[PDB]
């Protein structure tokens, strides 16, 4: 929607090395704001954005209690799954869970999410109706029965529709300055000769937020979608992103190429060209 | 704020 909140859980068993590890990170759109790792010196919830630091001790203690408990719940879960699949207690396994809520235009719940994966593959997920499940295989159905008998769906719906949205709105307020302002990218085109016959024109989009962006190389207005090489959007390390689109062109004809840039933090799409210095 | 995960798989 206009804004989203997600929590990413990773529980991994490690036979011989120690008891299972549990990591949880929280995101409001493309910004991480909290982290918990049951392996850190002191297993506790830590802030990852400046705006979440303005919350009192109660908040932190609350998160830490939930996570410490979760760490135990997941250890039991791993053991349960291992049993379902007839797996040796000698192999490492991973359970990943993701959930969150999407805020609509009216400030209310747009969509709720809850998906689980075992060893990289879909295990069970909450359906869009927020009242039914979709189990991947017969083992996931064992879990489905437990969760149905324990009415987990009702509990989750309550959370996604209430607590999730309520808190998302608080975070969006506390961090209004950075979470609700779209940072446009600083752009520029570079020229790199590969041989005396051809050269690479690389179009850069740096320091933008959110990550969503579209870079396109055009020759005489014609989109060169087929010849363009794009790198995956990557983090700059300061809560902004980077990305570049390259195209190989013949020496001299470079004057016929223009870079098209699309990002929500821009009034309209940008159109650049390489300028010889 | 996350939900209390009380029911195992």
């Amino acid at each position: 929607g206009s804004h989203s909140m997600r929590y990413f859980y990773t529980a991994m068993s490690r036979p011989g090395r120690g008891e299972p590890r549990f990591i949880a990170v929280g995101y409001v759109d493309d910004t991480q704001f909290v982290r918990f790792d049951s392996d850190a010196a002191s297993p506790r919830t830590e802030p990852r954005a400046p705006w979440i630091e303005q919350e009192g001790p109660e908040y932190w203690d609350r998160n830490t209690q939930i996570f410490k408990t979760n760490t135990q719940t997941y250890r039991e879960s791993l053991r349960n799954l291992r049993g379902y699949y007839n797996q040796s207690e000698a192999g490492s396994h991973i359970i990943q869970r993701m959930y969150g809520c999407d805020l609509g235009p009216d400030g209310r719940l747009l969509r709720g999410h809850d998906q689980s994966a075992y060893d990289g593959k879909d295990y069970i997920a909450l359906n869009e109706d927020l009242s039914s499940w979709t189990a991947a295989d017969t083992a996931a159905q064992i879990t489905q029965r437990k969760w149905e008998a324990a009415r987990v769906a009702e509990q989750l719906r309550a959370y996604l529709e209430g607590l999730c949205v309520e808190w998302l709105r608080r975070y969006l307020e506390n961090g209004k300055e950075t979470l609700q302002r779209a940072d446009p990218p600083k752009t520029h085109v570079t020229h790199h000769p590969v041989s005396d016959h051809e050269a690479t024109l690389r179009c850069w989009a740096l320091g933008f937020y959110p990550a969503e962006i579209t870079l396109t190389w055009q020759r005489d207005g014609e989109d060169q979608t087929q010849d363009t090489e794009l790198v995956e959007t990557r983090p700059a390390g300061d809560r902004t992103f980077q990305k570049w689109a390259a195209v190989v062109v013949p020496s001299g004809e470079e004057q016929r190429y223009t870079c098209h840039v699309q990002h929500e933090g821009l009034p309209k799409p940008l159109t650049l060209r390489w300028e010889p210095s | 704020l996350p939900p209390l995960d009380i029911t195992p798989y």
Partner: protein, 100 residues
């Protein structure tokens, strides 16, 4: 049991200017399982004051991490990122190229 080999990208936080401090980033993604070993190298030797982001993942369940350290670029030094994972027999080495 799914297995995905990691994608590596070595780059600086800002356009590199010899002599001026910057950050060297090594972004590894698209991998599974989570066990990964990443090192930032300076002329073959291993840099020790390297930090990294927290373990997170994408819709497809693959993990991603960002390893970074402060550095001052200079045309006489070669920086690279070494990544070892269960899907790699030998640790993959990706050299840093100021133009990418």
């Amino acid at each position: 049991m799914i297995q995905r080999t990691p994608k590596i990208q070595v780059y600086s936080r800002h356009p590199a200017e010899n002599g001026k401090s910057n950050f060297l980033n090594c972004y590894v993604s698209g991998f599974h399982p989570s066990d990964i070993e990443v090192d930032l190298l300076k002329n073959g030797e291993r840099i020790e004051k390297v930090e990294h982001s927290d373990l997170s993942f994408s819709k497809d369940w693959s993990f991603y991490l960002l390893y970074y350290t402060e550095f001052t670029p200079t045309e006489k030094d070669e920086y690279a990122c070494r990544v070892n994972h269960v899907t790699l027999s030998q640790p993959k080495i990706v050299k840093w190229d100021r133009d990418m």
